[PDB]
């Protein structure tokens, strides 16, 4: 019983991909018709019709309209698809916050066993980031105690349309830090490199990146949903990943990325996939964990996997001295196994695999990433160039100083937990 939210072009496209995947793996026609498991995300109507618990919000209608004229136009309840951080946090998103709250309340009241939220967004779109901050704060104040998962997109430190990204990132990160639960960074640079090296796609179209990311989101969420030999809930994810209220930004991982042709060139050893997950080049974040340490991990599997083999694999891989945890986390793992195997969209780039893994291993090199981001932020703020746009939209340099100090404090906390 969870609600999916999205913001920005990235949010909308990830929503599209993930909902398409869910429809696929529940045997649902593109129009919500089925020729319980789905009960959480798919409520049912009087007739044999379901409705995704989806709410997509963006300033520019373009993407929403294109979805409304897409193949899965009929799937969504038509009212669901409601249509510079300062711009998208103070003067515009504020004027639709009430409407989105009304729709959210209407949807949630239908529920009975609400657990949390799956809010998708990106740090790129300043409008999307600001609106995400405002909406997140309003939900936090509104609903007392419910999980607030986020699958955000972490821009690369070099590879990005870096024009105003640092300011958007600092503001959204600050607002999130104040009242968040755990945000899962992902970088398009990492996805590009992974698909090129492993999946062997030359020009990875943004929809293909969305497809892979959606498959990751499936591997996590459907595992949260499908019954299995070892299941898990959302509050479990929140509590087992947050050593401290501020350090809740684990990375992502996913082993099986083999295309069809080479899918026959391996026996799919559980240990091999676990190692690949721990293989530094297979992570979906630009960082070197060798510099840092793994605070805690959560391991989700699906398909033909055996707990004892998992235990043997993890023992073998961690016994490798290269992995360097901290001296106060003797127990920093959690496993998850689901009977259902992964599903592949027809014509999709990915190849069918009997097994699958998705790991959220909190690390500390993200501290170095934050450090470089803050340094670049300070450098760009020195000149104050292209800032009056922020100034006139309901913010002041005091806000910049406040966010700078808060992120410095967070980095200091990261260093503390580094010793």
């Amino acid at each position: 019983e969870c609600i999916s939210i999205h913001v920005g072009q990235a949010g909308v496209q990830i929503g599209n991909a993930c909902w398409e995947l869910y429809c696929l793996e529940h045997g649902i026609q593109p129009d919500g018709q089925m020729p319980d498991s789905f009960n959480t995300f798919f409520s049912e109507t009087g007739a044999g019709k379901h409705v995704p618990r989806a709410v997509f919000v963006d300033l520019e209608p373009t993407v929403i309209d294109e979805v409304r004229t897409g193949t899965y136009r009929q799937l969504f309840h038509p009212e669901q698809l409601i249509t510079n951080y300062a711009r998208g946090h103070y003067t515009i998103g504020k004027e639709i916050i009430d409407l989105v709250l009304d729709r959210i309340r209407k949807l949630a009241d239908q529920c009975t066993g609400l657990q949390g939220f799956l809010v998708f967004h990106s740090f790129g779109g300043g409008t999307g980031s600001g609106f995400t901050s405002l909406l997140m704060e309003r939900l936090s104040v509104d609903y007392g105690k419910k999980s607030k998962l986020e699958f955000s997109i972490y821009p690369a430190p070099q590879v990005s349309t870096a024009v105003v990204e640092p300011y958007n990132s600092i503001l959204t990160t600050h607002t999130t830090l104040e009242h968040s639960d755990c945000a899962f960074m992902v970088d398009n640079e990492a996805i590009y490199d992974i698909c090129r090296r492993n999946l062997d796609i030359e020009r990875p179209t943004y929809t293909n990146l969305n497809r892979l990311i959606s498959q990751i989101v499936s591997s996590i969420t459907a595992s949260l949903r499908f019954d299995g030999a070892l299941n898990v809930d959302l509050t479990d994810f929140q509590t087992n990943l947050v050593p401290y209220p501020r350090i809740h930004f684990p990375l992502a991982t996913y082993a099986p990325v083999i295309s069809a042709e080479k899918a026959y060139h391996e026996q799919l050893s559980v240990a091999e996939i676990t190692n690949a997950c721990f293989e530094p080049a297979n992570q979906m974040v630009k960082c070197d964990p060798r510099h840092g340490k793994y605070m805690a991990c959560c391991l989700l599997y699906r398909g033909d996997v055996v707990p004892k083999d998992v235990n043997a694999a993890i023992a073998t891989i961690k016994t490798k001295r290269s992995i360097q945890f901290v001296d106060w986390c003797p127990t920093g793992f959690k496993v998850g196994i689901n009977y259902q195997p992964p599903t592949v969209v027809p014509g999709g780039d990915l190849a069918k695999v009997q097994r699958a893994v998705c790991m959220l291993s909190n690390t500390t090199a993200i501290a170095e990433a934050w450090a470089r981001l803050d340094h670049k932020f300070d450098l760009m703020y020195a000149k104050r160039a292209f800032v009056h746009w922020y100034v006139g939209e309901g913010m002041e340099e005091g806000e910049f100083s406040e966010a700078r100090e808060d992120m410095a404090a967070l980095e200091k906390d990261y260093e503390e937990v580094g010793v």
Binding site: K145, T235, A296, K308
Partner: protein, 414 residues
């Protein structure tokens, strides 16, 4: 008679396969009907069952869980109709504090069910509890049930089969230390008898002796249920001696607190070699000359007391075992069910008590101190009322476990 209180996903499964084993042993149709060949059966059934007007037998079990998934799957199994829908209970919508808070919240209906089940029997002896100690669900809910049961029925035995987390491999719960320590403290405070368990050595033996390289939870907990059923056999199957649970417990427990056990089954042949095999550390399912406290074995099928005496003597001279210097074993016998094939000529099951178990507590206490020195993952615990103000409960439990370890070490010496 007896009741079963299985909690969390671990407990739910444990119960599923335990009742599967029982129905196999007593010739019980999956729907609850009784087979024609078993109509004239002599095996007692009240021990784990109470028949019904429709001639079907209803397990004396209650299903508890914070989530529906597992039990919902169970009710889609071929054995679903067997269970009693009234007893089953599912929360409408993973931390020990949260579990105990819910336990405080849903006291009423839980004990309504428990009282209804209890009043339907005459010779109730004690309680059986099957739960995991790591997950917040099993840990907290078991703590609440144990506390209120000891505070409600002060004249009934409480038997628990806890499942402890893997250690050499990273424990399957990051917040495992807190839940484990608190659950152990509750067990010391109230629990009567315990049968500790761990997935590590359990799967180790499952792979090294059962000759199966793909053991799912199904096979693991199937072996666990086998241990349970073989433990209860003689009680189920009346004989001459040891015709009651109290007889079992008295034969082992030396003192109030020092009541932890370890188990093992050989044929997962001769009465001599079997009990020999029951002694090795490999066969003990669980993972400074530490020694034993009490040793008990139960044998199935044909047995010659002359064989038993001679074999026990011969092993006694071989001094393969160790006893407490300051204090002065047992070999019980029973019969096999008339249904299951006797693929084994003669079997052997052991449930002894050993001071070495202190090592597990030492490991867990070290881990808890490790965490507390840096206050890791306490943010959510403060959310609950119980840990809203302070964490004195944690300190008290840690000191209690330390006192228990000191008592064990003292018992290791005269």
């Amino acid at each position: 008679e007896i009741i079963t209180l299985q909690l969390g996903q671990c407990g739910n499964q444990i119960g599923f396969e335990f009742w599967k084993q029982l129905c196999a042993e007593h010739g019980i149709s999956p729907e609850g009907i009784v087979e024609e060949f078993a109509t004239e059966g002599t095996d007692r059934k009240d021990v784990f069952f109470y028949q019904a007007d429709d001639e079907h037998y209803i397990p004396r079990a209650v299903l508890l869980d914070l989530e529906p998934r597992v039990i919902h799957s169970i009710l889609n199994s071929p054995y679903a109709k067997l269970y009693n829908p009234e007893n089953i209970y599912l929360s409408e919508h993973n931390n020990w504090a949260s579990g105990f808070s819910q336990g405080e919240k849903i006291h009423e209906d839980i004990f309504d069910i428990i009282d209804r089940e209890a009043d339907g029997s005459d010779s109730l002896e004690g309680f059986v509890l099957c739960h995991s100690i790591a997950g917040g669900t099993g840990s907290g809910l078991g703590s609440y049930l144990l506390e209120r049961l000891n505070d409600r029925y002060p004249k009934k035995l409480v038997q628990t089969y806890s499942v402890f987390p893997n250690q050499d491999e990273m424990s399957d719960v990051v917040v495992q230390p807190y839940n484990s320590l608190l659950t152990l403290k509750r067990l010391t405070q109230n629990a009567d008898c315990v049968v500790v368990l761990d997935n590590t050595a359990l799967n180790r033996i499952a792979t090294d002796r059962l000759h199966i390289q793909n053991p799912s939870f199904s096979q693991i907990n199937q072996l666990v249920s086998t241990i349970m059923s073989a433990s209860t056999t003689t009680l189920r199957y009346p004989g001459y001696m040891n015709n009651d649970l109290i007889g079992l417990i008295a034969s082992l427990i030396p003192t109030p607190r020092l009541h932890f056990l370890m188990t093992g089954y050989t044929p997962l042949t001769t009465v001599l070699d079997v009990m020999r095999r029951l002694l090795q550390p490999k066969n003990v399912m669980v993972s400074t000359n530490h020694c034993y406290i009490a040793i008990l074995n139960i044998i199935q099928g044909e047995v010659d007391p002359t064989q038993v005496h001679k074999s026990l003597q011969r092993i006694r001279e071989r001094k393969l075992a160790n006893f407490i210097p300051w204090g002065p074993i047992q070999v019980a016998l029973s019969r096999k069910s008339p249904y299951l094939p006797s693929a084994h000529r003669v079997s052997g099951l052991m449930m002894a008590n050993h001071t070495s178990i202190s090592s597990l507590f030492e490991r867990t206490c070290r881990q808890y101190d490790k965490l507390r020195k840096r206050e890791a993952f306490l943010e959510q615990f403060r959310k609950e009322d119980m840990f809203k103000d302070n964490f004195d409960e944690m300190d008290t439990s840690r000191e209690i476990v330390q006192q228990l370890i000191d008592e064990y070490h003292a018992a290791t010496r005269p």
